[PDB]
Amino acid sequence: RQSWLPGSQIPAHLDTPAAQALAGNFGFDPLGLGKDPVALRWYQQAELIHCRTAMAGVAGILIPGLLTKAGALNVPEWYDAGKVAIENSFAPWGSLLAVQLFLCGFVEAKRWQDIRKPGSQGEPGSFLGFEASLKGTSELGYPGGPFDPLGLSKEADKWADWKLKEVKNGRLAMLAFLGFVAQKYATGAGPVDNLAAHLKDPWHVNYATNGVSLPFL
Amino acid sequence: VRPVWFPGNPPPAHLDGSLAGDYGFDPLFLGQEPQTLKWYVQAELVHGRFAMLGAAGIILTSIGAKVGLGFPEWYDAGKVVVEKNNIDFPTLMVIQFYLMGWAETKRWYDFKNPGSQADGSFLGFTEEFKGLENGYPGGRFFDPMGLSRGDAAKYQEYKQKEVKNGRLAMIACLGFAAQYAATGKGPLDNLADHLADPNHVNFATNGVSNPI
Amino acid sequence: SRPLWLPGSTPPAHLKGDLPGDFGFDPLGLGANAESLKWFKESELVHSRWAMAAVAGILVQEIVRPDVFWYNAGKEVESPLGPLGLLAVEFFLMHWVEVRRWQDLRKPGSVDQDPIFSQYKLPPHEVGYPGGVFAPFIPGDLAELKVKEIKNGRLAMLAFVGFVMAAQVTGKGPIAALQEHLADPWGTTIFSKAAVVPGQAVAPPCKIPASVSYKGIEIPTPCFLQGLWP
Amino acid sequence: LPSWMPGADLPGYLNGTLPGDFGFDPLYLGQDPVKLKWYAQAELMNARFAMLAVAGILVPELLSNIGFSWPGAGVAWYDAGKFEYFAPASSLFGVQMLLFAWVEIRRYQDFVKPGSANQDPIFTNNKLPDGNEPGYPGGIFDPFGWSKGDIKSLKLKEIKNGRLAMLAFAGFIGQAYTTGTTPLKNLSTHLADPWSTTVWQNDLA
Ligand code: CLA
Ligand SMILES: CC1=C[C@H](O)CC(C)(C)[C@H]1/C=C/C(C)=C/C=C/C(C)=C/C=C/C=C(C)/C=C/C=C(C)/C=C/C1=C(C)C[C@H](O)CC1(C)C
């Protein structure tokens, strides 16, 4: 098997049939958090949700960020998108935050009750009729039905590969967003401009020169 | 009997003579545990290799410096190489830590698990990162000419020569350091100065070595 | 055991007499591994052949067209061909040839067939000695001519390094240096130019200049191992 | 038995059934057979669009230097987006995506279930023959009576011209980004002076 550190002793809780059947297992647990299988279950759920929302957010940063260097899509910088949006908008930000709290709390409550009980949300008479297709698909965190419309999740031969691509791209996306934050506080411009200013002069413009990222040198 | 570092004293129990450069020199008994002695074997070899390479650098640069070529002396080369080309100091140091950390970490985790890096995790390489002994990582990359797998007794001779030259180089580099701290001049300049007047230019004349 | 270098001595245990022109010369033991020894065998053959062709080039180049300093010749012969174009042709062509030969080395008996014309096939051989169209005929016998080629090769390699230093100290060609030396044998040797004493050390001045301005972008020209001359 | 490197070991999963199987995969991209199928179909499609593209960049420019008078007088291949048509490019994009959605999803439905998209939905008499071969349709897509010969030769030829055309279109992108000119003019100034117009020559400016 692959390991993060070849030659390192892989911990015994990440070496089970239950833990090796997880997407993107690389035996990485230096701080031994996942000693409890229930806790490992919950943490896997946390990783999946963070992956999906991280991909969505970072794509939202990049793709308008890239395409604005072309002609179309005049988009302001991601750290200024809220202001301009709310000046474009019709309501104050408080009411928008309240509405999103409601509409997201409902859904997250659903998903949470499905985490505590696996076959929960599908029981007769609960919803007006989507109770038909709100069960799980035998692997928690990966529902079916109205999710996965295109039927890509039906074939069994591509299954682990779709999983593994998801988790790898997601981990990379989380790293990307943390990078967005740090580059915002460090240099003071958009990430696309950081990429351009680094490709323009690599040996002079990096975090060894920005004067904040390591002040002792 | 083996030649001992001190003719007459028997050698300690943990030192036998299977190693290279084994003269029974351990008054503080720092290597009594076998794992600790194994680790110190690797430490001595690594320090010796960097010392040999460094002293060769110092001597060759000073030879080029005394003859009128324009090389700086070794206490000035860092400043003039960083200053003169364009090079930013910290990015060079950081890349040093990148590469050295990668390779050195490979070495560390090959010590902990002795045959682990020969699995194929690195790009595609198998049995060219398997170690031969403790601190002798001979494969295709580290023994390209192929001296370790032929003429085994002559190879033991090479081990002996490596350790002896390494120790000599370590105390040589210490010599360069303290010599520059005392006289404030270049090392081969000191060699020519002592070679001009041996009876009157030595350490007993600087006034810094013996303050009596 | 035929003769050997430093006769009367004993050869190393790995050199026996299979190869042409082996005399037991390995004090460092650089041929203990057979898998090394094959690569080094090919290395010796190739270096010898390049050196022979280059030494004959230098001699005949001086003879036919004198007063063209071979050590400068690149700054010379420049033609309507661009140097970039020459570098390109050399790169691609030599890349092809060396790759084919090396493929024959690491995988024997594979590149014997002409790729374009599928009729011709190079016959079986011993590595490093292809034969076929590479040698139309043998004057004499094989096992002697192998010895002769290795001898002329080692002599030629020494001759070329002699040419390089003989240019970087004097500043003339080989035959011109020979004329200078026959003009005064006691006064023009390497011992007659430089010496080291515990008092002082003196070296010959380098005749060859600094960075050479070929086409604006200058080529830095150093002499080999400048600081350790006598 | 041909190779991309005569003597070197070929990967085991390639067996010549694919057109143009030369055993070239130094990155081992096609170990799984499913990925091999998808990659093969992708190669065919990329090849055909490359061949049509390179034809559509050579032929207008080749017929530009000869001097006809249709309003495509040699403007460019990359300046095809600043010309007055008889429709702005937006509706062009719309109709394009509708028609190609129809065609490409139909083709994908053939690929997932081979032998299922054969008959004409409207005029239900017209039907493709049962030589399905996902990626090689047949029937009216081979209207002029070919495929009579040993088609492995013609498949091999199609894939060779496709690979050459893909590299050619990569060439058009690279040359037009670097020199910023038309490609037959690049061949013109290269046939003018082959020794002082090279890549190494131009990249030193
Ligand atoms: C291109 C260089 C080269 C190479 C690779 C070889 C290779 C070989 N020679 Mg060889 N040889 C050469 C040049 C070379 N020769 C020259 C120039 C001479 C004349 C002096 C000889 C004379 C010679 C004899 C008399 C014999 C060999 C033998 C051998 C074989 C076994 C020895 C061995 O393992 O060495 C491997 C060689 C190397 C690893 C190359 C070492 C290069 C070092 C590291 C560079 C340092 C050299 C130093 C700068 C000194 C330079 C000289 C100076 C005057 C300029 C081997 C195939 C023996 C043989 O045939 O047995 C099979 C044998 O009997 N050679
Ligand atoms: C593994 C482990 C294990 C062992 O045991 C221990 C240790 C080691 C400690 C650990 C580690 C950990 C880590 C590292 C983690 C990380 C994380 C992250 C980074 C996340 C993020 C994450 C991230 C995320 C989600 C993100 C998201 C984002 C978003 C939404 C965005 C949004 C937006 C947009 C669109 C645009 C607009 O205009 C604005 C805004 C609003 C801004």
Sign of CA dihedral C69, C74, C75, C81: positive
Per domain, the residue ranges of chain A are: 12-200
Where do the structural domains in chain B lie, given as residue ranges? 34-196
The closest of B120, B131, B121, B141 to B42, measured between CA atoms, is: B131
Q: How many CA atoms lie within 13 A of C206 on its CB side?
A: 16
C44 CA distance to ligand 1 centroid (A)? 7
Query: Which tokens hold the place of A156?
Result: 């069994």
State the helix-helix crossing angle for C34-64 and C83-106, rounded to 10 degrees.
150
Exposed, middle or buried by CB within 10 Å (0-12, 13-18, 19+), for B65? Answer: buried
In sequence order, the 6+-apart residues with CB closer than 8 A to the CB of D4 are D22, D23, D24
Tokens of A85: 């949006």
CATH class in words for D33-203: mainly alpha
- The finding on whether A57 has its CB within 6 A of some atom of ligand 2 is yes
How many other CB atoms are found less than 10 A from the CB of residue B110?
19
Q: Are B107 and B114 in contact (CB under 8 A)?
A: no
**Rounded to whole angstroms, how far apart are CA atoms B115 and B134?**
11
Residues of A in contact with B93 (CB under 8 A): 208, 217
Q: What is the C-alpha separation between D66 and D60, in angstroms, rounded?
A: 10
- On whether the CB atoms of residues B51 and B177 are closer than 8 A, the answer is no
Start-end of H helices in A117-189: 159-186
Q: Please, which residues bridge with residue D127 across strands?
A: D119
To the nearest 5 percent, what fractions of chain B are helix, strand and coil?
55, 0, 45
Instruction: For residue C122, say whether it is annotated as part of any ligand binding site.
Output: yes
CA distance A78 to A184: 10
Domain assignments of chain D as residue spans, ordered by start = 33-203
B121: which 2 tokens? 């995790």
Determine the residue type at C120.
Y
Using the Cα atoms of residue B106, residue B111, residue B116 and residue B118 in order, give the sign of their dihedral.
positive
DSSP state of B39: H
Instruction: Report how far Cα D79 is from the mean position of its chain's Cα atoms.
Output: 21
Q: Does ligand 2 have an atom closer than 6 angstroms to the CB of A177?
A: yes
CA–CA separation, A128 vs A120, rounded Å?
15
DSSP-derived secondary structure for B143-211? SSS--TTS-HHHHHHHHHHHHHHHHHHHHHHHHHHHHHHHH-S-HHHHHHHHHH-TTTSSGGGSSSS--
| DSSP run (H or E) holding C196 | strand C195-196
Instruction: Give which of A179, A183, A216 is closest to B89, Cα–Cα.
Output: A216
Cα distances (angstroms) measured from residue C94 to each of B42, C25, C88? 45, 32, 10
Q: Which residues contact C110 (CB under 8 A, 6 or more apart)?
A: C103, C104, D6, D7
Chain A residues inside the 8 Å CB shell of B116:
6-7
Q: Residue A86 contacts by C-beta under 8 Å, 6 or more apart in sequence?
A: A92, A93
Query: Looking at domain B34-196, which CATH architecture does it have?
Result: Orthogonal Bundle (1.10)
Q: Say yes or no: A203 contacts chain B, CB-CB below 8 A.
A: yes
Cβ neighbours, 10 Å, residue A208 = 19
Element containing residue C212 per DSSP (H, E): strand C212-215
Task: Summarize the annotated binding site of D for chlorophyll a as residue ranges.
Answer: 4, 22-24, 38, 43, 46, 48, 104, 106-107, 109, 120, 138, 157-158, 160-161, 163, 175, 190, 198-199, 202-203
Cα A158 to Cα D5: distance, rounded to the nearest angstrom: 32
Which uninterrupted H or E stretch holds C41?
Answer: helix C34-64
Q: What is the CA(C50)–ligand 1 centre distance, in A?
A: 15
Give the H/E segment covering residue C201: strand C201-202
Angle at D202 between CA D199 and CA D205, to 5 degrees: 145
Contacting residues of A for B90, CB less than 8 Å apart: 208-209, 214, 217
CA distance D179 to D78: 13
CB distance from D204 to chain A under 8 Å? no
The answer, for C85 touching chain D at a CB cutoff of 8 Å, is: yes
Identity at C79, one-letter amino acid code? S
Handedness of CA B6, B10, B13, B19 (dihedral sign): positive
Closest Cα to atom 23 of ligand 1: C25
**Superfamily classification of domain A12-200:** Chlorophyll a/b binding protein domain (1.10.3460.10)
Nearest Cα residue to A140 out of A111, A161, A169, A165: A111
Indicate the residue type of B36. T
Which pair of structure tokens corresponds to residue A130? 């989507």
Q: What is the dihedral of CA D25, D29, D30, D32, to 10 degrees?
A: 150
Report which secondary-structure segment, H or E, holds B55: helix B34-66
Reported as type and span, the H/E element at residue C215 is strand C212-215
Sign, CA torsion B121/B125/B131/B135 = negative
The resolution in angstroms reads: 3.4
**Distances in Å between the alpha carbon of A206 and those of B91, B98, C186?**
8, 14, 64
Residue with tokens 């070595």, as numbered in its chain:
B209
The amino acid that residue D4 corresponds to is W
